[PDB]
Design a protein around this ligand. Sequence first.
Ligand SMILES: Cc1cc2nc3c(=O)[nH]c(=O)nc-3n(C[C@H](O)[C@H](O)[C@H](O)COP(=O)(O)OP(=O)(O)OC[C@H]3O[C@@H](n4cnc5c(N)ncnc54)[C@H](O)[C@@H]3O)c2cc1C
Ligand SMILES: Cc1cc2nc3c(=O)[nH]c(=O)nc-3n(C[C@H](O)[C@H](O)[C@H](O)COP(=O)(O)OP(=O)(O)OC[C@H]3O[C@@H](n4cnc5c(N)ncnc54)[C@H](O)[C@@H]3O)c2cc1C
Ligand SMILES: CC1=Nc2ccc(Cl)cc2[C@H](c2ccccc2)N1CCNC(=O)c1ccco1
Ligand SMILES: CC1=Nc2ccc(Cl)cc2[C@H](c2ccccc2)N1CCNC(=O)c1ccco1
Ligand SMILES: [Cl-]
Ligand SMILES: [Cl-]
Ligand SMILES: [Cl-]
Ligand SMILES: [Cl-]
Ligand SMILES: [Cl-]
Ligand SMILES: [Cl-]
Ligand SMILES: [Cl-]
Ligand SMILES: [Cl-]
Ligand SMILES: [Cl-]
Ligand code: NA
Ligand code: NA
Lengths: 484, 489
Amino acid sequence: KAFDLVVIGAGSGGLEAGWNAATLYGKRVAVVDVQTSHGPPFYAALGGTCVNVGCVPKKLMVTGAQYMDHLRESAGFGWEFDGSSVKANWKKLIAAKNEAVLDINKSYEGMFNDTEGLDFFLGWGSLESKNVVVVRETADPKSAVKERLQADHILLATGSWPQMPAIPGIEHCISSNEAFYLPEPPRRVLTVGGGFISVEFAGIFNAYKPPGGKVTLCYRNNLILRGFDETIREEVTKQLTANGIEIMTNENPAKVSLNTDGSKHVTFESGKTLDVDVVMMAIGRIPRTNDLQLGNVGVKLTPKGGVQVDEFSRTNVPNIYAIGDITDRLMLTPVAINEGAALVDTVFGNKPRKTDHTRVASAVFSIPPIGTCGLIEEVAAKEFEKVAVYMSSFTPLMHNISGSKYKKFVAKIVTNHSDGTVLGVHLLGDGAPEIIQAVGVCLRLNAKISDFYNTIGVHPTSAEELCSMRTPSYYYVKGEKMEK
Amino acid sequence: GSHMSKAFDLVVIGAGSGGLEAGWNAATLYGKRVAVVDVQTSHGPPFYAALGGTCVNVGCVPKKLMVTGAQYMDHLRESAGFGWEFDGSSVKANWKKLIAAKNEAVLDINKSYEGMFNDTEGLDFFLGWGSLESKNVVVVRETADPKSAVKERLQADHILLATGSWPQMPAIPGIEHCISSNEAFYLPEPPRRVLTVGGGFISVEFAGIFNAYKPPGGKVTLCYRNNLILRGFDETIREEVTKQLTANGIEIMTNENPAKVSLNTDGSKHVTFESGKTLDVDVVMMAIGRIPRTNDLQLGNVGVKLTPKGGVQVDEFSRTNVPNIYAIGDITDRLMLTPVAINEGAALVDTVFGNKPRKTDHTRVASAVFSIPPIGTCGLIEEVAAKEFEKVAVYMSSFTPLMHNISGSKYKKFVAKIVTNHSDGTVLGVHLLGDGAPEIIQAVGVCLRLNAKISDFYNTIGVHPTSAEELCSMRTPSYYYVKGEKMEK
Ligand SMILES: Cc1cc2nc3c(=O)[nH]c(=O)nc-3n(C[C@H](O)[C@H](O)[C@H](O)COP(=O)(O)OP(=O)(O)OC[C@H]3O[C@@H](n4cnc5c(N)ncnc54)[C@H](O)[C@@H]3O)c2cc1C
Ligand SMILES: Cc1cc2nc3c(=O)[nH]c(=O)nc-3n(C[C@H](O)[C@H](O)[C@H](O)COP(=O)(O)OP(=O)(O)OC[C@H]3O[C@@H](n4cnc5c(N)ncnc54)[C@H](O)[C@@H]3O)c2cc1C
Ligand SMILES: CC1=Nc2ccc(Cl)cc2[C@H](c2ccccc2)N1CCNC(=O)c1ccco1
Ligand SMILES: CC1=Nc2ccc(Cl)cc2[C@H](c2ccccc2)N1CCNC(=O)c1ccco1
Ligand SMILES: [Cl-]
Ligand SMILES: [Cl-]
Ligand SMILES: [Cl-]
Ligand SMILES: [Cl-]
Ligand SMILES: [Cl-]
Ligand SMILES: [Cl-]
Ligand SMILES: [Cl-]
Ligand SMILES: [Cl-]
Ligand SMILES: [Cl-]
Ligand code: NA
Ligand code: NA
């Protein structure tokens, strides 16, 4: 048939857009994805990346990894049990996680079957013509048609995909997609990348590794987590190191060779070499524009490969839009959901609406975790004459007793010191992703450091630290960092 | 001949949350000479509170360490769903190691605060019992008995009453066979059977603590004289916490109140309730309330007025009816929270000795209950809002989060409620039940001070996946109050 909306990709942005359209505006909706439940061969599926091979499973797996610390820390509070009997059963975790994700898949299939004006179609979506969306048997454009769908408006929402550098032996490496399905936990693993996915997986592999195991993370520059607060980048590095993860900075794989025993011999650009069981490449993610045949209608892409869009998600082709990681702005699930909701408002609603990409709160589920919203001091120091930085950094008391003395909680607020406006807040330590959520609301109300400081603390919490700081630790004046 | 009393700009009676913030500020920000009196320099019996106050010695700080310890019962069980394996029959909760660990942690804070007195010019500590001899004279005596020897007679321009509160022990037969939270912190063994009496945060928290450490075959029971524990808290939350305590094996007896306690011949306690019901326990912990600790201060010497309830009456600036005598913290019977006593102490010193007169805002204060899982709350419950606002909206989200399907703790429903003035969207109250609630609520306290509306919450982009994001994903009320009445408009 024909439809008001055809959505390519049943993901965060797509499922949101295609549900608002059918339930808030009774529109006729088609949504195409390549698989109806998680895992190989195509990994993402109905629900999107986040649901099948992203935020949702990774969080359950980091929750599993945190028991390594809980079991050990328990002793400090007088819990006694046979330490030598402890094992981390990876196969149970992955089976548990598989069932959880499968239940969400089935449940999203429920909602298709029970909603009129919202139809899901299995297969590979491409642009045949200005208002025709083909669905083929496979990603091969030469492959058999399953459907041609007519559509007023077409939404491009096919997400992103791991970036695999084209070094010799790249094909002996996995990405996070495969990481979710390893049948054994690796004894030696190299995670390649200094960003959140590399870090988060290093912490997961670190808890589930067999006896004698070792996690090594490498990164081509000097300090991991570029784009995060610098004190926190250094402190997470120390805390990952304290929990046994080896961090190799200033190193980059130039070649991977397969050993006869299935292991990998990694050669670095420096000529250093390391043998491991698994190389997980997590150096970035790229917009998933390749199989869409965007040539067939001349939809433009940026120097970086992402669908180019204006503030309202419109491509250069009338009646064709793009939201989510395909656009290459902020690769976060709730950003994509916001974009998709706003699109449908601006197209079958009365009020135009655009997604604000500033002041978006986000989290790294490292162990210990990170919670941030707003500008880091070095970005602030370039756009503002006077910047103040309020910092508190204490190993909390629970962690003196636990034995995890290396677990410092870090709280920083960055301000425009001229009028006291909070430019950014950056947290490291247990609960940080939860603490920062309503911080994002504050930054929307143009909170000042005195609005924080004058709110009465909840005690005892890590969070109250944010309402106890009234004196700057230091400043940037005209870009120059200084004491007073 | 005669010689001079030690003289101060400020004498603070009670070295606790409020008194220490006041004393510190007056001395280090405004150059005042400050005396601070407390009955002990470190935690524990005979007097329990000490240098640092109730929170440091026998309140928030040790209790949170004990609750963290109690949480490992759940973690060790929950870990099995994520694939952790170990010998479950080897598991034991060693109460003695917990108490030893917490004592050490509290003693280091006591030592640290004493070092701060020693290092800080114009800030002096006095060990003993402080009382008002006259409008500008504080005397410190050997014991709480007003006839015990005077150790020091202090000249004081200004006097701050900051002696806190004390457990309320009902006048029933066998009350002397009961304890309070004070003694709970020092039990040599974990009790096998305990009754916590009261339905407020202290009874509830200690019920979870004793539940985790009790020996084989033990039972924890909490009773409350009324229908539903945790009066003052959101009603959905009160009912969920009740269910979640029950699920973890605590016995909740509502509409029951002890009428007497007798000692059994084995030393256990035989509790008879008003209703005629009875219960045998090893420990009866009375946690039915805390009363302003005004009795040893000899306030009649100077005519400081009490309220009908027994707090020192003060105005919005912490002034009593007697010039240069002030009262902050639990002794004033407003909100008994450590950071409120702190805020009162800062505001009072700013007003008296600074150039910034200021009063504490007791509305929209965030607080927590360290139940397992915990409560975080800030602002009005809906039944209070409905009485003051013509249209009130209630946004509710509730569900067992996914980790807890996998963990096996399916009774663990997260609840998030936002209560609004519906005529303009202003958030009046936010109520949370679930893991990390106390941590989530802190920045909510800031939102409310900025008069955030629901539309600010909803407009903010979620952090995924968190429980906190539920607050930013709610756009349609679950129901309303229209002049006092519940419906969906
Ligand atoms: C390991 C990992 C962890 C992450 N963790 C977080 C986190 O904690 N928090 C957070 O906010 N974000 C996280 N993200 C990012 C988040 O998953 C993405 O930002 C989000 O899913 C983007 O949504 P989308 O709508 O743009 O696309 P997706 O949710 O990726 O959906 C795209 C869909 O299109 C389908 N598809 C692709 N091509 C076609 C085609 N040609 N025809 C039909 N269907 C097609 C795919 O099967 C996929 O289901 C994580 C990502 C990864 C990889
Ligand atoms: C078990 C328990 C748990 C608690 N948990 C929390 C929590 O998690 N969060 C929270 O915010 N609040 C909590 N509180 C409450 C918090 O402890 C109090 O609100 C706070 O300590 C009150 O501060 P204050 O300055 O009034 O007095 P306190 O901190 O009680 O200090 C008063 C001091 O005066 C001393 N004193 C008394 N009489 C005399 C005298 N005549 N002469 C000299 N000194 C004297 C006492 O020794 C004491 O050290 C808890 C309380 C209890 C009992
Ligand atoms: C609103 C919504 N947004 C989504 C955003 C991103 C994802 Cl990955 C999933 C959803 C989800 C959904 C699930 C199936 C089809 C379309 C949307 N979904 C549906 C949630 N609501 C209900 O199922 C519901 C049932 C009854 C009333 O509302
Ligand atoms: C500001 C403050 N407020 C308190 C509020 C409540 C309590 Cl219970 C304790 C304090 C603490 C303090 C500790 C000793 C004497 C007076 C104040 N105290 C001082 C903490 N120490 C410092 O700020 C410090 C010590 C050394 C350098 O800075
Ligand atoms: Cl395994
Ligand atoms: Cl890299
Ligand atoms: Cl760098
Ligand atoms: Cl990446
Ligand atoms: Cl967290
Ligand atoms: Cl014991
Ligand atoms: Cl009671
Ligand atoms: Cl009641
Ligand atoms: Cl009480
Ligand atoms: Na504050
Ligand atoms: Na939102």
